[PDB]
């Protein structure tokens, strides 16, 4: 969230953070900002990306 | 260094100067500011003297108390003068002097 | 990477030879000041003396006293010797002549210096001898005390340079050697180096005649030799650091084609030799401080002056916008 | 694999910290743990922190511990005790902590299983950030003294407290 | 880049081997002094001072006057502590 | 002129230092084809990795 | 797998500190050492997260936590020293007089 | 640029004054010419002056403390809530200092560094109240904690004081490590440490099935540290030993100010943040445990200090009931309970410090006090009955809200526990009154009369305790104001 990157440029996930914060700054229900929030958290941890790639690896191991 | 004086709670009195310079604030000191300043310094010197008698250092204790009182009283007077110029405190004198110069 | 061990050996072996001959040079210069000859029988002009002494040491039976710290007692000299060796990985001898071009090299040198104390402490404690323990404690306290001033002087150079890279520190002195404007800082650095290497007039472990037993008194054969070799390698390293930080490393004295003819490694070597000669000369010239006096000098003189030089250099460079 | 080696060294050295009968030995093993930690930091690309862990943890803190523990001359009778009767209580507490706390990141940070395909070609390189690279040192120094200077100064206050307390509790002037 | 640290590791391994060879070839043919604690404490404090100096020294060109004065305030606090130690006799070994 | 005896061990030390520089410099040059470059950063490493392709695949 | 491996390293250090508290009932010096081990593990946690998240906040706080660890060890060892000086021993049976 | 620092004028002044006093004390304490005068009382008076000037600067500059809030945002956050919290903290520090002069001169505790450490810890607690980030919160907590560790061991030749310090440092460091671990887990899971960012990330989800175990355990560890700090059961056993073994002025100071600061922190972290029902259940279970254990253990005590320590544990249980029920009235009642408990504790420790001039240790040492000092025995009896919560004394407010929160939230077990523990507490509080008024011991202890400072402080706190419920409107309004300012 801070924006200070470890190599002296804008942090990797800072634009996602700022989109989420700007959404929540005027949407009275946080459920309206769910998509931007999960985009921010996906940028931090890559959970869904790695899960999908592991599904691909799983199917490869099944068909071999 | 990026700076931003903007306060959370807006000023309730006319803003004579949003971010007054140090010397402008000091030159804005009124008689009441000097009274606050002098009272705080005098009380501090008195406390220094009285508390210094038993150890036997009443003079140096007076000096130490006076330094504390000088710094505190100046900070308090500056606080009041700057708050008046910024519109956070009642500032009839500042507004009157501003509408003329 | 297959050729890296060859480079490492080409550093380590000539360094060990250089230490062996630094001992001989110390003896020779000390003798000549004292109107005598020093080693001149074992080999021509005494040039085979170091090999004979090393051979004697390896052929000496080890003692290993019946202590309860059998492992630690032998590992302490290994630790100090390895630490003396590994600082040379980042030392540049000329442009591009360096094993590891560390961007954080200055702090790495500071870390190695800070690690040096453990060999002495462990040797004192493991030897099962109250005299060795007390001497080791005093020596360790002296080294940590002067490390503060060494670090602050490092910071002064860093402020001037703007990079922890030793080669960059050298090349930042192309306009002028840092030892000219910061001459008192260089004097302070040399004295702190004397104290940090337990050298005269700060050589407490050499003060046996003063009822101050050294930390290595229980050592014989090659553990004692390892301590000695590490100490002299550290003397060479401190001379090299003085050369790098203040005398412009491999740079010539004047930016002229006549001086640029001779290689930079020779410039660096000559400056290092000057500083080693000053080490020997100082040992020949003066008596030694007491422990309490040198501790007072470390904390009461060199720390305040080092901090003041940090403040003055930074303030001046910020004021006129001369920062790197 | 390399992280397996360093973690194994850290595990053994830490067990030696907590289980060595002689406290001087505990301090020495502690020093081995900090060396291994510095190795990990070098793997992360944080060379400033890797060096500072040597300078401060080993060069200053461990030296303090060693000076104090060595002059104490602790006899083993004063601190000895059999630990065989703790194996169960350590087993539950360790297991529960193990089952919960070694795997806490697994649901949030799912690992990428390494496949029999060269994913290295999918690494995208942006040269724009490589024109002027910042060291760890200068990235940290860009922030400590300007945008977060208050925390820096509070840390100074903490150190001042340490100095005052050290004097007031232990000083006996000759 | 961390590439330059690999030669340091190989150098350490070789230096260790040289140490073992040299050391192993000859095998073939209750008085607590508080002042040491005090000097340890002082070294710890000024060790952290140098630690905090390093990034500041490399960052002076970017932090400008604000960073300079913030470090000056840091040093002022630590130097007040040093003056306290000096007056109390922590720096006297007699 | 007897004092020249003491200059021989110092000269040997200086030659030793020159060796510790130059021997490691020439071994690196022979192995890599060019002398070591001081200040190898991310950009230089990326340049070398991309140049391997641009050369070998030509 | 990098991030899980870096985290479990720091985690074993933290668990070792906990175990050192549990196993050292007669040795309070080692208890202090175990507390430092936990502090080291937390510091490592901040540094790893800083890299993983590409964020500098973990690094600033790591430096400040090192300062806190230093001050903590200094004051703790002073208190150890004075306790030993009063009792002449570090055994736990001589620091159990406050109770109930 | 200079005007930006109006937001930190109070803190700048107190820090600078503390430095001035440190220099003054060290320069003249070492003076041969002046024959090494004791300076604890001189520095104490000057530091009381400094605290009062800090209070003036802060109270009179209410709007100015919010100036340049964007510039200061990543460092701290000053508002209405922090305003009143910091005023109350400074008032408590001033009272505690005023109670120390007889101890300084009669015991001859000459160390002026005691006052300096108190002032630095006050600086730390001031920064604790305004902390708005996990990093700042941790740093301020650590500064405060290190100052306490040092002052707990100030009687450095005493077995009791050294034992207190050792236990405090070990258990404090352990709890701080646990809290820091929680902070690291939260950062790793959310990429944030600022309280605003944490509020945005955590709100709307709590435990929506896909709950961040990292976030959940970070919260848990932070809560464990907080509960240690407020001496909530089962993280409490440090408190009685430290309270008894420390010098009594230290015990008085620890009994009040850290609670103010850490509850400020707890409100702004949890209440302003979002994991939710789990954490209110944490404080629920710890409140019940604290009430039960405090009541029973206090009933076991034969010594005054230990009795007061266990009493404070029970009362923090009563207070945390308000945090648990998660309503504006809950927060208001928690604040009212802290204010009233603080003024009662100040009264009790003024009496204890007065009696320490004759070395009061046991409850039985109070025998025949109604004969040897009738007005003192009555004053102490009013404090005890207020502690018991007997109306219409001020202490009745906490009992009233304890049952008000249970009956409404549906908590009949909590009401049961409150009834039982209130009766147990009343028994061990009126035991003291019985000792002073009903007993006829063979040997009496005659106590030296207290100094003017403690008599005046006692006189004012005794009028407040007896007469507060005649005019309770300002506290009620100010605490409703504070509860609202947490979210608006
Ligand atoms: C002063 C006092 C003295 C004491 C002291 O200080 C204090 O002295 C100090 C001196 C210190 C030592 C200094 C130095 C090191 C070396 C370091 O070790 C480097 C290891 C790193 C670098 O290794 C490679 O790095 C590059 C490859 O990455 C290589 O580049 C190629 O590849 C490029 C790309 O194609 C091409 O473009 C290039 O052209 C091409 O050349 C490069 O050559 C090579 O170096 C990390 O590598 C690993 O990391 C990988 C990631 O995790 C792991 O991947 C694996 O996991 C993945 C899934 O996660 C799977 O996908 C993978 O399939 C699967 O393999 C895997 O284990 C392994 O690769 C380990 C630490 C240590 C010992 C320090 C210890 C502590 C001290 C003793 C200090 C001590 C305290
Ligand atoms: C007691 C006993 C007695 C006996 C004994 O032991 C002790 O006594 C001991 C005493 C020892 C001697 C001591 C010293 C040397 C000099 C060395 O030779 C110069 C070193 C080589 C490289 O280093 C230079 O170069 C650096 C970079 O410029 C200089 O840096 C500059 O720049 C920096 C940045 O601005 C500034 O910071 C610096 O200030 C600035 O100076 C650096 O200073 C300088 O040293 C000389 O290079 C040349 O060789 C190249 C070959 O490729 C040729 O390249 C050419 O061909 C290429 C291909 O077409 C083209 O691509 C190229 O364009 C094109 O140039 C070309 O001829 C030329 O470059 C040869 C070894 C020897 C004799 C030692 C032998 C062994 C001993 C006799 C020992 C003996 C055993
Ligand atoms: C009086 O002060 C002095 C000392 O301290 C007492 C010395 O140790 C010494 C001498 C110490 C040395 C010569 C150590 C030198 C060691 C080396 C050059 C490295 C090893 C050299 C050798 C000949 C050992 C060879 C070992 C092998 C396994 C052979 C294979 C290679 C002198 C000269 C001295 O003056
Ligand atoms: C109804 C409330 C709920 C129930 C709680 C009751 C709590 C009390 C328990 C009641 C049972 C009996 C209590 C007996 C106490 C009465 C005796 C008493 O307190 O007398 C004191 C009197 O204590 C006081 O001083 C009380 C002062 C309180 C002032 C409150 C009045 C405020 C306005 C009055 C203005 C001044 C006076 C105006 C007229 C001159 C005398 O104290 P000594 O220790 O004996 O001697 C004092 C020393 N000397 C006489 C020399 C000065
Ligand atoms: C409200 C605080 C105002 C400033 C407080 C001054 C701080 C130091 C004064 C402490 C009191 C003091 O000095 O005590 C000495 C003396 O006490 C005093 O005389 C008071 C000193 C000054 C306090 C009052 C003077 C006027 C203060 C007005 C406000 C300023 C010592 O007493 P003794 O040992 O001589 O007792 C013997 C005698 O039998 C007592 O009954
Ligand atoms: C051993 C040495 C001791 C030195 C002690 C003397 C100095 C101590 C520091 C005193 C504070 C500053 C005094 C110097 C006055 C000159 C300040 C000045 O020149 O103004 C500059 C601004 O200077 C400052 O504002 C820095 C003030 C330093 C902070 C000092 C702390 C004061 C109180 C902080 C409150 C936080 C709570 C404290 C926590 C313990 C103008 O800079 P700029 O606005 O043009 O641009 C900013 C910069 O160039 C780009 O980054
Ligand atoms: C302790 C014993 C209590 C003290 C006795 C009662 C105090 C009465 C004195 C005040 C009288 C005159 C006040 C003057 C006044 O209104 O000016 C304001 C000063 O406020 C003030 O002077 C504020 C005083 C606050 C008293 C302490 C409140 C404690 C709250 C309890 C919570 C404790 C729990 C903490 C975790 C600033 O003007 P302003 O009105 O513009 O400023 C706030 C805007 N928002
Ligand atoms: C005698 C008969 C009663 C014995 C105790 C009954 C235990 C069961 C009560 C129970 O269900 O506890 C729930 C949790 O309360 C709790 O707080 C849990 C029980 C109390 C735990 C803390 C106290 C432990 C003991 C402390 C002293 C001993 C220390 C160790 C020796 C109450 O449900 P609820 O009140 O949440 O319902 C809120 C509805 N709106
Ligand atoms: C709300 C319920 C109802 C309350 C009633 C309100 C009425 C207002 C109070 C009126 C006071 C009546 C008496 C006034 C005349 C006495 C003047 C004091 C004389 C004086 O200078 O005292 C000095 C000591 O300071 C002292 O003794 C002063 C310090 C006393 C402590 C109180 C202030 C401490 C700081 C604030 C505490 C706040 C705590 C709340 C959380 C010197 O005395 P000496 O010359 O006899 O020599 C003592 C031996 N050293
Ligand atoms: C944080 C906030 C904490 C502040 C603490 C509040 C004070 C604690 C109360 C303890 C002593 C006060 C005595 C109670 C007053 C008894 C009569 C009540 C009454 O009506 O008196 C009014 C208030 O007097 C007064 O002002 C009472 C005297 C003050 C002492 C004067 O009536 P009014 O008409 O002037 O006021 C408008 C409201 N009736
Ligand atoms: C605030 C920013 C920096 C903070 C840190 C540094 C603060 C500065 C250091 C303060 C330390 C205390 C200094 C005490 C100096 C005492 C001098 C001395 O010996 O005085 C005796 C000396 C001679 O008197 P004797 O003691 O009777 O011989 O001076 C006096 O006693 C003068 C008394 C008259 C002063 C009244 C007016 C005071 C107003 C405030 C100034």
Author numbering:
A (entry chain e): 2 to 65
B (entry chain f): 1 to 101
C (entry chain H): 2 to 325
D (entry chain J): 1 to 174
E (entry chain A): 1 to 29, 55 to 119
F (entry chain a): 3 to 60
G (entry chain K): 1 to 100
H (entry chain N): 12 to 499
The authors write:
Here we present the high-resolution electron cryo-microscopy structure of the Arabidopsis respiratory supercomplex consisting of complex I and a complex III dimer, with a total of 68 protein subunits and numerous bound cofactors. We propose that the main role of the plant supercomplex is to stabilize its components in the membrane.
Apart from high-resolution structures of the polypeptides, our density map of the I + III2 supercomplex contains a total of 94 bound cofactors, lipids and metal ions, including a butyryl/crotonyl-CoA molecule in the γCA module of complex I and ubiquinone/ubiquinol (Q) in the two QO sites of the complex III dimer. Furthermore, we modelled 4,837 water molecules. Complex III2 binds to the inner curved surface of the complex I membrane arm. In the Arabidopsis supercomplex, complexes I and III2 interact at three distinct sites.
